[PDB]
Amino acid sequence: MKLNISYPVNGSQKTFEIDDEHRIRVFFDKRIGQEVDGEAVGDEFKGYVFKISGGNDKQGFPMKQGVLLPTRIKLLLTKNVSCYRPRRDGERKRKSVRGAIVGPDLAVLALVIVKKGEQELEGLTDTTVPKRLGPKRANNIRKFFGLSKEDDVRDFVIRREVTKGEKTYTK
Amino acid sequence: MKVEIDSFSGAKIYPGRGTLFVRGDSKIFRFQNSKSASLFKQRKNPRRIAWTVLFRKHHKKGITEEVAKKRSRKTVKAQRPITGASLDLIKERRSLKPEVRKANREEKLKANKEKKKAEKAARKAE
RNA sequence: AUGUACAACGGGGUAUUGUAAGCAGUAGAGUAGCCUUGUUGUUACGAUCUGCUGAGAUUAAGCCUUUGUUGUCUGAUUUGU
RNA sequence: UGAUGAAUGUUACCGCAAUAGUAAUUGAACUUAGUACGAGAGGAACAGUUCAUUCGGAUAAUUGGUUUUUGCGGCUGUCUGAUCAGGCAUUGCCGCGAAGCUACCAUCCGCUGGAUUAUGGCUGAACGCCUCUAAGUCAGAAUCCAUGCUAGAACGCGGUGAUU
RNA sequence: UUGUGGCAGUCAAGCGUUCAUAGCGACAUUGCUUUUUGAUUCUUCGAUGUCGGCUCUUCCUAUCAUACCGAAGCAGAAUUCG
RNA sequence: UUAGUGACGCGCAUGAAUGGAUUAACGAGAUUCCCACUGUCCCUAUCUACUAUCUAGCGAAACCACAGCCAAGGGAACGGGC
RNA sequence: AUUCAUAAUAACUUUUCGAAUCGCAUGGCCUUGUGCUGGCGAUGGUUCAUUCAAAUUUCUGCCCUAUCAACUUUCGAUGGUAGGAUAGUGGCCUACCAUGGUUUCAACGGGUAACGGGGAAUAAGGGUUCGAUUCCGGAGAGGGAGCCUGAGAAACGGCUACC
RNA sequence: GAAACUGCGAAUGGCUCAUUAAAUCAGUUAUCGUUUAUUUGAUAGUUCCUUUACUACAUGGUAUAACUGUGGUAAUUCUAGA
Numbered sequence: 001m002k003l004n005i006s007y008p009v010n011g012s013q014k015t016f017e018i019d020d021e022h023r024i025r026v027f028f029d030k031r032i033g034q035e036v037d038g039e040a041v042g043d044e045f046k047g048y049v050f051k052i053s054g055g056n057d058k059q060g061f062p063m064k065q066g067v068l069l070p071t072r073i074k075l076l077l078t079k080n081v082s083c084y085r086p087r088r089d090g091e092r093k094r095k096s097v098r099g100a101i102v103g104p105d106l107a108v109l110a111l112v113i114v115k116k117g118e119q120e121l122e123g124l125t126d127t128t129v130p131k132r133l134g135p136k137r138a139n140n141i142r143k144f145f146g147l148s149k150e151d152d153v154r155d156f157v158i159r160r161e162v163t164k165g166e167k168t169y170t171k
Numbered sequence: 172m173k174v175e176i177d178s179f180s181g182a183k184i185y186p187g188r189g190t191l192f193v194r195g196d197s198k199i200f201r202f203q204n205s206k207s208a209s210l211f212k213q214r215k216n217p218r219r220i221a222w223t224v225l226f227r228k229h230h231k232k233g234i235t236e237e238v239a240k241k242r243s244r245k246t247v248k249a250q251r252p253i254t255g256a257s258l259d260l261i262k263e264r265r266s267l268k269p270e271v272r273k274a275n276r277e278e279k280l281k282a283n284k285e286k287k288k289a290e291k292a293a294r295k296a297e
Numbered sequence: 298a299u300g301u302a303c304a305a306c307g308g309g310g311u312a313u314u315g316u317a318a319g320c321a322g323u324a325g326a327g328u329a330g331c332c333u334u335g336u337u338g339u340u341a342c343g344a345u346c347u348g349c350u351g352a353g354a355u356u357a358a359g360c361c362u363u364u365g366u367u368g369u370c371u372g373a374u375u376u377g378u
Numbered sequence: 379u380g381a382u383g384a385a386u387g388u389u390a391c392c393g394c395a396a397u398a399g400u401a402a403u404u405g406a407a408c409u410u411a412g413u414a415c416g417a418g419a420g421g422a423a424c425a426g427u428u429c430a431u432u433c434g435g436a437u438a439a440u441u442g443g444u445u446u447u448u449g450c451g452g453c454u455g456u457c458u459g460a461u462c463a464g465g466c467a468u469u470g471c472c473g474c475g476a477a478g479c480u481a482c483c484a485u486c487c488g489c490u491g492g493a494u495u496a497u498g499g500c501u502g503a504a505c506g507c508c509u510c511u512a513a514g515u516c517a518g519a520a521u522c523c524a525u526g527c528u529a530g531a532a533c534g535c536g537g538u539g540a541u542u
Numbered sequence: 543u544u545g546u547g548g549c550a551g552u553c554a555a556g557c558g559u560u561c562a563u564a565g566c567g568a569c570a571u572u573g574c575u576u577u578u579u580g581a582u583u584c585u586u587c588g589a590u591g592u593c594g595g596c597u598c599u600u601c602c603u604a605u606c607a608u609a610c611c612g613a614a615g616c617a618g619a620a621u622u623c624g
Numbered sequence: 625u626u627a628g629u630g631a632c633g634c635g636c637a638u639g640a641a642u643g644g645a646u647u648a649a650c651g652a653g654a655u656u657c658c659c660a661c662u663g664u665c666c667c668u669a670u671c672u673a674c675u676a677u678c679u680a681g682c683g684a685a686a687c688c689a690c691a692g693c694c695a696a697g698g699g700a701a702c703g704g705g706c
Numbered sequence: 707a708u709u710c711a712u713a714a715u716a717a718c719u720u721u722u723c724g725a726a727u728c729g730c731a732u733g734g735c736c737u738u739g740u741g742c743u744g745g746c747g748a749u750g751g752u753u754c755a756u757u758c759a760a761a762u763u764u765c766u767g768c769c770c771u772a773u774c775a776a777c778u779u780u781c782g783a784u785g786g787u788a789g790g791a792u793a794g795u796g797g798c799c800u801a802c803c804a805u806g807g808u809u810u811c812a813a814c815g816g817g818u819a820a821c822g823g824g825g826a827a828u829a830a831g832g833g834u835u836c837g838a839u840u841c842c843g844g845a846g847a848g849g850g851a852g853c854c855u856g857a858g859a860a861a862c863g864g865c866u867a868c869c
Numbered sequence: 870g871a872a873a874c875u876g877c878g879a880a881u882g883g884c885u886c887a888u889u890a891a892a893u894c895a896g897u898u899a900u901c902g903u904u905u906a907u908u909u910g911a912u913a914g915u916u917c918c919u920u921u922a923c924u925a926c927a928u929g930g931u932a933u934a935a936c937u938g939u940g941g942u943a944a945u946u947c948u949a950g951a
Contacts, residue, residue, distance in 0.1 A: 004939055006951040013939040013951055053950055060942030062949040076866070078854085087946060088879090090855025091865055095947080104173070108941050110950035129951095132937050134253035139929070145258075146250045147265040149925075150274065156264070158255030170255070187440050205442085206314095206474060213473080222315055222351055232351085278740055286738035293734070 002108040003041075005050065007121075010128035014121075015108070018042075027052070027109065030102040032065050038117055047117025055109040057098045063106070070101035134158035179207035179217050181224035 001024055006013040018024055023041050030036065030052050038048025054063040061072060062083050077084040078092045086093070098105065113124070120126055135141045138153045145156060159170035175184040178200040189203040192211070202208040210220070217223040227233060252258035267273070 002941080004941085004950060006939070008951055011938085011951070015939060015941095056941035056949060058942070059944090060947065060949090062941080064949090083948065085946090085948080088855085088864065090853095092854060093865065094867095097948095108939095108950090110939085110941095112951065129937070131254060134255060141253055144251065144253060145256070145261050145265060147261070148268040150271070151265060151268045152274070156253075156256050156261060158253045160255055190441065209474075220315085227351080230347095279738095281740040283738055283740095285740060285742095286736080289734065289736070290738085293736095296734080 001106065003111055004055070004108050005111040005113065005124065006053075007113045007116075007124040010124060011131075012124040012127050012129055014123040027102050028104070029070075031068070032063065032100050035114060044119075045117065045121075046119060048113060048121075049115045049117070050111040051114055052102060053110040053112050055102075055106050057105045058107050061096055061098050063100060063110075064097045065100055067097075067099040068101065069099040070103040070105065072096055072098045072105075134160075175201055177201055177203045177207055179211055179223065180204075181217075 001018050003016040003018050004013065005016060018041070020042070026036060026040050032052055032054055035049050035051045038045030038050060054065070056062050057072075064075070064083050067073060067075075074094050074096050076092055076094050079086050083097050084093060084095050102109065116125060135144055141153045141156060141158075142148070142151065145151075147153075147156065161168055161170050172186055174186075176182065177184060177189070180203060182203045184201050184203050189201060190205070190208055192200045192202065192208070194200070200211065202211065210217075217225040218229050220226055250262075252261050
């Protein structure tokens with residue numbers, strides 16, 4: 001099986017090809033939002049605790065929230081909802097999914113960390129991806145920094161230097 | 172192996188124990204026992220049958236599953252820079268914000284500038 | 298024929314069934330009568346519903362098990378290289 | 379067909395095994411192989427594997443059936459002043475229903491060695507050759523007999539214990 | 543008893559492209575069986591319950607299939623004879 | 625589909641009050657097919673009461689040369705006896 | 707021709723609109739302040755009217771058939787009252803009520819190699835026949851049903867199901 | 870200045886004539902019985918709601934896409950996770 005684990009503060013993410021079939025039998029019959037023990041799955045993950053975010057089973061059909069079963073279903077989905085993007089306004093659509101219970105049918109299980117255990121993880125905690133963008137709005141910058149109502153966000157602006165050739169500029 | 176759930180009673184069906192039914196519409200039902208099977212053939216409603224899990228959960232009996240939703244009593248705790256602002260100098264200028272005579276003097280400069288602007292504009296208009 | 302003895306009851310378990318009677322209800326189609334005519338108004342009747350209640354009942358008779366209780370435990374006949 | 383049983387000195391236990399009976403049967407599929415063979419057309423086989431047909435012998439975990447558990451619930455009519463709880467209705471009727479019985483309607487199992495026939499042969503004369511035969515001799519079948527399985531001679535037997 | 547019914551042999555004119563016998567085998571002929579049908583009337587008329595089917599066992603083989611084999615006008619498959 | 629029905633008719637031997645040809649309705653009439661239904665059946669199983677069974681008590685009858693093991697033989701041609 | 711337009715009293719609203727939008731140009735007063743004012747536009751925005759539409763609607767008019775003369779109303783057919791729905795009237799639908807309504811002046815039913823019309827061929831006149839078919843109005847997207855989005859679809863080169 | 874958010878439009882066009890015989894349609898009326906985006910012409914002094922601190926108006930809050938990357942199906946204009 002695979003565990004697509006993520007650490008959201010570091011913004012990091014990695015897949016882990018898991019075996020120890022019984023240390024994933026623990027994951028069996030589990031819902032979304034629930035948090036089980038890193039040590040229980042793996043002493044390499046000793047002390048850690050994750051949260052079962054979701055996952056794709058075979059045939060790539062994701063895990064959807066709220067349905068409360070492991071078996072697959074055909075839902076007449078609509079906008080503002082996971083597992084369907086509408087290619088037109090108004091289009092509802094019947095699509096197949098898998099539900100919010102964990103079992104062998106799954107192939108990749110998506111996890112998020114809420115607490116960092118005692119040891120350190122190679123591709124999640126030792127690393128941290130930066131914030132790709134800076135806040136583009138005045139007050140968002142202003143409150144992000146904690147300056148004032150009048151501290152000139154215009155000069156607190158972000159400047160991201162890049163070189164076209166040798167001419168360089170922050171754009 | 173796996174264990175499953177009676178359509179009617181909603182009970183674990185250990186392997187072999189029990190019957191299975193496949194309606195013409197390809198709906199696969201499972202029954203732990205001929206009791207459930209016979210009721211199903213009678214077209215009964217388990218939500219009305221009392222000993223069933225559906226009635227149990229519809230009348231809210233044995234409700235030890237749900238507890239509450241947790242809440243954190245704090246903030247995000249990141250007054251960080253925006254990757255192009257040098258957070259040290261950012262906090263330094265945030266602290267220089269009070270005692271605002273600097274921005275006030277810049278305003279006074281641009282203010283006398285607007286004075287002279289209207290003056291010279293009227294001069295050019297004349 | 299005085300014991301890790303036996304038996305009848307009781308208990309526990311396991312199973313079957315489907316939520317006992319009794320009480321209560323600001324539940325109840327409503328119909329009549331009360332008046333301080335409410336804002337649950339009260340009263341008589343009224344299937345049925347809900348809570349106590351996966352409650353109650355039955356459970357070896359050819360189910361299992363008992364630290365329990367109460368008892369029982371020398372009557373007859375025959376047999377020889 | 380099953381079932382008892384006097385008598386053997388008594389009684390109990392463990393055994394032998396005469397004799398009799400006997401059972402396992404056939405096919406398909408994949409592979410061998412689109413190979414061999416065949417000009418082409420078409421088209422094999424032995425071994426191996428998985429399955430089934432027929433028959434048999436058991437068993438009841440599962441599923442199904444059966445239900446006087448007259449166990450639980452409900453239903454009609456009527457009687458017990460009403461309720462509670464019950465009687466009668468040739469087991470009143472329905473639904474569930476354990477246990478037990480039971481089903482190719484369910485499941486499990488169904489042995490390997492020898493002598494042989496037919497047939498093909500080895501050496502080999504008669505018949506100075508030759509010949510499977512005449513003396514001798516090899517392999518060989520759903521055959522035959524044993525292994526195995528069933529009963530155990532009630533006048534077949536043995537070993538052992540205790541014997542007032 | 544066995545004409546007739548049925549079954550199997552001897553012989554081999556011929557058929558089989560040529561060749562009687564791989565396979566068939568007319569004309570002639572020797573036998574067998576009693577599952578037919580006759581013929582007979584021994585027993586049975588002071589009664590042997592009388593067709594078929596159903597059920598169920600057992601037996602014969604003149605073997606339809608299956609086991610092993612031989613022959614072929616058997617290349618293989620399929621088939622035929624034994 | 626030797627059945628059933630509709631046609632054909634050198635009809636062994638159809639036929640007109642020895643009544644012919646139809647004929648609604650009716651039939652515990654004979655017959656065929658279809659729907660339903662089903663333990664008739666594939667294929668049997670299970671349950672109940674009364675029996676059988678054992679007991680106490682009561683207590684017949686039919687039938688009977690003598691009696692009661694098989695094979696073959698011959699024999700009144702199919703014996704329990706020889 | 708109105709209970710019209712429109713105005714006011716009294717309240718209702720889970721609360722509607724009343725510019726936090728954008729490009730150019732930068733203009734003027736001095737109370738010398740980033741003070742105050744200012745232009746040409748785009749976008750959107752409540753109401754009314756307009757325009758392109760849309761839906762309903764009045765009179766008249768349609769081929770052959772009586773080997774179709776009674777038709778409609780159970781469970782809407784005709785009307786009325788009240789209400790619901792509609793964007794809106796109204797059996798559009800419901801509750802209740804009266805029992806009516808169409809018919810030889812051909813109802814109703816059947817058939818149509820019938821979508822209709824503007825028009826085409828053909829002729830002295832009269833006329834007969836055709837007209838799917840370039841323009842107009844309708845219907846449909848394989849048959850049916852349903853519906854979301856939207857001002858506008860019962861959309862099909864959009865969704866849902868069944869066939 | 871791709872992609873993406875957003876706003877428009879995708880209900881026009883085009884194709885066929887299956888349907889349909891007071892139905893469509895044609896002329897002719899009405900909406901004093903209705904919706905109408907869009908255009909076009911006009912049109913929001915009155916929005917502090919214990920209306921005094923209850924509230925920045927040189928102006929307020931929230932994602933979320935695109936993207937970063939983890940990726941999952943054999944396949945989908947398939948999509949989740951951070």
